[PDB]
From a paper:
The particles harbour 10-separate genome segments and comprise two principle protein layers, the innermost composed of 120 copies of protein λ1 clamped together by 150 copies of σ2 (viral polymerases, λ3, are attached inside adjacent to the icosahedral fivefold axes). The outer layer consists of 600 copies each of μ1 and σ3. Here we demonstrate that vitrification of infected cells followed by cryo-focussed ion beam (cryo-FIB) milling and cryo-electron tomography (cryo-ET) allows high resolution reconstruction of assembly intermediates of a mammalian reovirus, allowing atomic models to be constructed which throw light on some of these fundamental questions.
In addition virion-like particles of two types, ‘empty’ and ‘full’, were observed. For stars, analysis focused on the fivefold regions using emClarity16 yielded a reconstruction at 6.6 Å. For the empty virion-like particles, reconstructions focused on the fivefold regions and pseudo sixfold regions yielded reconstructions at 6.5 and 5.6 Å respectively. Thus purified virus particles provide a good model for the in-cell empty virion-like particle indicating that the internal RNA does not alter the fundamental organisation of the structure, thus at the fivefold axis on the exterior of the particle, there is evidence for the σ1 spike being attached. If there is indeed some similarity in the assembly process, with collapsed particles being transformed into an expanded state by the recruitment of the RNA genome then the empty virion-like particles we observe would be dead-end products that have failed to package the genome.
Numbering used by the authors:
A (entry chain F): 287 to 335
B (entry chain F): 433 to 578
C (entry chain K): 287 to 675
D (entry chain G), E (entry chain I), F (entry chain H): 1 to 365
Write the structure that this text describes.
Amino acid sequence: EQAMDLVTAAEPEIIASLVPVPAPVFAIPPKPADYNVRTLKIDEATWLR
Amino acid sequence: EDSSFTAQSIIATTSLAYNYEPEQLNKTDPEMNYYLLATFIDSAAITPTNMTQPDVWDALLTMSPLSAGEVTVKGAVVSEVVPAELIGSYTPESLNASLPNDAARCMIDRASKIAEAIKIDDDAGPDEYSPNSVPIQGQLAISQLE
Amino acid sequence: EQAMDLVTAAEPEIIASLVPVPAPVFAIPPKPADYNVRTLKIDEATWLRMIPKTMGTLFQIQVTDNTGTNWHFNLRGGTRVVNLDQIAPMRFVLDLGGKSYKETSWDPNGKKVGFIVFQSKIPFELWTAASQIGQATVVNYVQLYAEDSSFTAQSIIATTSLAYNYEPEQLNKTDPEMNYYLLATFIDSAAITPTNMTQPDVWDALLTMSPLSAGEVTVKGAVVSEVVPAELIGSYTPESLNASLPNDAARCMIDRASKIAEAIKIDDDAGPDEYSPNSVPIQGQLAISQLETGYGVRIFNPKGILSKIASRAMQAFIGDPSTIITQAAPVLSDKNNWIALAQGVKTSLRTKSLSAGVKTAVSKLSSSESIQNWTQGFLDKVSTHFPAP
Amino acid sequence: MEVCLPNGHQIVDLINNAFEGRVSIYSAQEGWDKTISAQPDMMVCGGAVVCMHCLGVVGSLQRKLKHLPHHRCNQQIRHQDYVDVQFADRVTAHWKRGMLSFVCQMHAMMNDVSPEDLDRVRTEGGSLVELNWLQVDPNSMFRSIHSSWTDPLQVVDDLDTKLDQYWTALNLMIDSSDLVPNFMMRDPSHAFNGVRLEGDARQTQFSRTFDSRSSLEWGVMVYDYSELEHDPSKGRAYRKELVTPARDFGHFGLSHYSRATTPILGKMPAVFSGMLTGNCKMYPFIKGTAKLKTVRKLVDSVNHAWGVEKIRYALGPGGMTGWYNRTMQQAPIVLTPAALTMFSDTTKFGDLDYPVMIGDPMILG
Amino acid sequence: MEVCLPNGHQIVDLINNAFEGRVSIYSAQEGWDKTISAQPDMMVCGGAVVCMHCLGVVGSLQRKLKHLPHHRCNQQIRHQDYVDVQFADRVTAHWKRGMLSFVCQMHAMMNDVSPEDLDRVRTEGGSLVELNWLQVDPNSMFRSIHSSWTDPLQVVDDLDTKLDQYWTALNLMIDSSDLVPNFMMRDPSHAFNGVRLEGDARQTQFSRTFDSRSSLEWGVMVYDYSELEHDPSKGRAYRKELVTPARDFGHFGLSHYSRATTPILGKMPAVFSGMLTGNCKMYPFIKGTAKLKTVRKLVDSVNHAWGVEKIRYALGPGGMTGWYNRTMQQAPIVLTPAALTMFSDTTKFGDLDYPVMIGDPMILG
Amino acid sequence: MEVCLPNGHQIVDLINNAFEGRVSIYSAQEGWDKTISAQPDMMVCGGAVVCMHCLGVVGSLQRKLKHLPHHRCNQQIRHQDYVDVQFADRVTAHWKRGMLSFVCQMHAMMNDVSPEDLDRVRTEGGSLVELNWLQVDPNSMFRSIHSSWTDPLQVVDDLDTKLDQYWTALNLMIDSSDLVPNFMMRDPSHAFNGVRLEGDARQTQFSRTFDSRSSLEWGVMVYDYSELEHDPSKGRAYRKELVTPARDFGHFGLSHYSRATTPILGKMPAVFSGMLTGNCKMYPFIKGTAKLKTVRKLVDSVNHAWGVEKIRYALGPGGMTGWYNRTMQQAPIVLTPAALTMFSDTTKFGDLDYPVMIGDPMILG
């Protein structure tokens, strides 16, 4: 029963979805990240000028 | 200050924090471009010889999202995504460069929950078949026949 | 039911208390953290203690341990030490690898360094003479070898973990004047010339500290024996929170909030900037604030505009629940509002009677039906390979 | 509107800015302007804006507000307790203005000197020029009996850049000349106690702080080298070897060490950063311990004003009284400018050779 | 077996590697060896295996592939889309073979010089050796209209090691004897825009890019010092002071700066990496805008052949079109090598003293 | 009370200390004091407290214990299995006592020369100080048959401190006097394999180990440099050119190189680390592999006596036997002092020209 509850919470249709899924529906709480802007590669980051 | 290692200087701990609200900017003109910089700031124009750094971006930065409604896909924020296309679509370098709001990271968390669920349901060891693995074998056989 | 279990774990009235609360009920297990004493900033943090610079006092001292080994070492000016007195039990692990630490006739590689604890009435900062250190003892020491580092012409000390577990009972402090201090420095049985080695301490090293007590918290800029969650709410600046150690009650409040945040998320799946049942307590709190006569500047804001601001505030909480501890947080300024919402959220979970959203399920069923169609087509190709008679 | 009492770091910051004169203060009469004196309404400490009447942090640098709407403000604070912060800031601004004006006057006299005359002086030595201190800037509020601290501050813009350019240029010119200014001192502590004081110099009394209690009015004072000029048995070469400031403060081109001037304004010494630092920073020779003593009475009033539990959360463990005791311990470290100890470590020549007297400033080769 | 496109970073890297002429191509007849021309079946992009018939990444460099498995291939890929890229790579390879053969010839001729002859010239100066440019690599399509990129690639083993050693030996010999070659240039700009041309040499056209339209067959152009020999004012001593390259480029053994030749081959001067960089590397000084335009047809075909979301995720903002515009903005940065910027900025002698024309290569004193 | 086995790294640390004669050992009769020989009850090994009767480790210095806690003792641990380790540590301690007394004697003798005589000798070279090798620590086991490892340790205080001070003074004195010792060797390998022994030197047998199978009592080995003084061509100037230790070892105050004497005690030279490195450390020239081989018998005993799972967890892969073999492979890696390689590479005077004999230590120019 616990395994089935976990699978339902995961949402197999959402994880394996082949059709567009709304960002609020697909997303889950995000986590912070740290970076050193001087060391970032411009060939990797499209968010910097 | 100077470190225990001689000839090494240590800067005191800092917590410089900037909150970026795009809605606070209320951008209307597309021409308007928004740029973020972090550098030593002085009220009087600095003598260029005194400070030669282009910026002080050579620093350790901790970022906290002020947005909870935006997710990034293929380098862009997305109102919706295709999970199947998401499958196996990131190189290690791309995932490493991804921002904290990246869809791939969210997909990976959901995938880890599914992997844990599958492992709870199946106690089969590696190289041991199971009712949940043989369908995959069938898919592979069909793929080769196709 | 999972949401109700979350509410039961939260005990929100306790976690929203503005009046005195028993310390043990709020307290939770502490987490070990790493710091570099050279990197440590004593002025910002009330807890940090270091002998002030400009005292410039260097004196060599020798003591024998329970085994009876005698070690000669000299405290030097600007040296900082862990203030053991009043910090309760603690276990510390030190990594000095990569610090050059090279003396003119002394090679750092192969040297032994030790941790020394001094017990005496005189303040370590007030120490000006050898007798002031009192019961100073090297709890642990390490002899290590170093090899060339990645840096060109640079050698790197090998990775090390000098570690000692210290608890209050071993000191058995009975006198307040008696003060306990922990120091990281090279220690040897033989006397060592001070001129060759100028380091005040080897505290400029990677250090891992494991707390053996979680009983110490500081709020209102003051160390507190018992903690009030409302006092905890909105009381730490980002730099101030950084100053706050893991034992600080704010981190415990944040974990309780994360369970509460999970309950709130289960309660509301509405889109950002959209009025929702979850924000009804929030709008009411703001409305009461709007009702409140405005000290100095006084303005009136539309209820629909109030709803939009409340939606933004709620989305901000969804993005970061831990922001609540921020001192005078403009976004998280009202503790009573948080307390009221918490009671309301628990009620909404309790009031909830089988309410669910049809759209996501119908979209999933549609995708499932297309997958079913795909499955049918694959079986059909298989029948082409293996047709039913 | 619930309000938050200030944390210790913000208060230390507020004290430094007040001595700094860089504090941000909002007064309804002047808005965020502090040029014209008015009772303080809003001030910025430790990255946050504080309401003076309720003694609570009204705002932070994160947001911009034209004015404060009606809000919960105790207003039970006594202005007498916090009058000192405003007084210190006003005193600092006027004093900085005075130092710059005195600097402009001396540099202007040097610029006026024709190059041929300076070369002739190099040939014979002696003081290049002098200015009448008795007639010097009596217009200043410190130098005018009519002028008052309450009097509105003069509008000043571009002061720092001009100060930096003039000081560097003056120092470079003096270095080429090797003439000896008599308006500077090898050791600042000697000025309060060390150099002999006679007559008006004997009459001189040093409070050693800018405060409401001690008069800041005093005459221009200079080292006594007129006697050596009259007794030229001592060589101009001998003076360049020793009397020269580079001989005492290190080569200015080769030195980051700060150099000390005589306390010309109301017996107030000025600190100038060494050339190797690459910029000119001005500080009066006043101890930070005095600033700490200034906040002690205010600390007692605030302790009564705010709840102990709130203080325990904001200041953390030990309380505001404990915070102040720890601060009394840190009075030597937290508020200390580096430049004050940045001067040349020692002087071989010594200062007992020449006394200091109240005199017109001059530089002599 | 369905396949997906590689990442934009991988594609930009693939373009840079291709311009290096290190393109990895698999053909059934020759497998992964591109020495013998064949239609490519697969190509390696950024450490990944892409199908050349469906343009789909099917694997990575970690897994070796010896055959292409039967797969669901779109088969809409026209060879003509990337055959031109193959032509460019093959031509670049032929150009490298020509440069190597030319280096071998120059090195051998220099080695033959007897020390007595060398000393007599050291006493006098002047070109030690002269080569008829008509004899320089005539068999190549660069000096033969008949020769084509479609011709088989010359077998080359250990090309890089040999080239580095020969260039180093030649430079060391020239440095020891302070020699002056007529085939070296201080600054690239004069090569297509600066050196003065004579007669038909004025009609010589440097494309500054790679295109199939331009014939690659041309004469060898070099600096003209016949007038220099005629000129009385520039003797061996004058040359040692200024003409010898070491005065402008620095001592070869003591400098990181790159050294460049006149556009001897392919109307292209060659740049060799500095000795202190740890190797000597020869590259043509060419912009990457052409490489970016050459991917334009590929982008259109892919946009027809790929999903919107997949393209947005892989090519980034603006899909492939947006990626192209942003990359065009980055072409000065993403496609411009630092090695192109490794030459000495300072050149005392100057490059406009003598004219450049198709002429006999020589080294003079 | 159960007990736990030790780790192999802790064992390596214990072995290094045992060869250094500094092992911390506890006996019930003598507690932690090892001055009087007794069967060990506990030892401190590689950061752990080991039971010497049950081989159990369950204690740490952080919490002091008055005595070995009442424990379940296997009593299967044979003293003969580890007695050699105790023997090695005790003998090394006695050896250190002898070395210290010898250093003190040399320092006193060096301090016994009149300055006028000292200056005349510095000018002409020749004998200045000579120590009667019979007078050096006559009562020790290495110089007296009566002394044994089981005998009580001579009570000594600051042995390391005294040795360091005397060695430093002696080295500075020799450096000032430029004396050349007949009691030092540039290379240790010559001592057992190179230098030509004379008389009893020919009979000398070097165990190159610490075991109770070889007489440790022996005469003080020195160079027969008598013929060198006899040699006319080796004048004081000639000796300073090539013979002087500063030519071979460098200046003691100006060199990082280690300094090694001849095998004065127990046929063992004393080598001290370079002063400039920070300190002078003296160790006997012993191979680490032999010490591990001594541990071999105990390893076999432990493998027979301890549980396989416990042995695998404590001694690591291959059990104790595997750990020993891997350690034997890594013995140079962890058992070799760096100072051995810290001697000056250049040697002018050398160690092979003259023979070695048991003689009086002396230094001359």
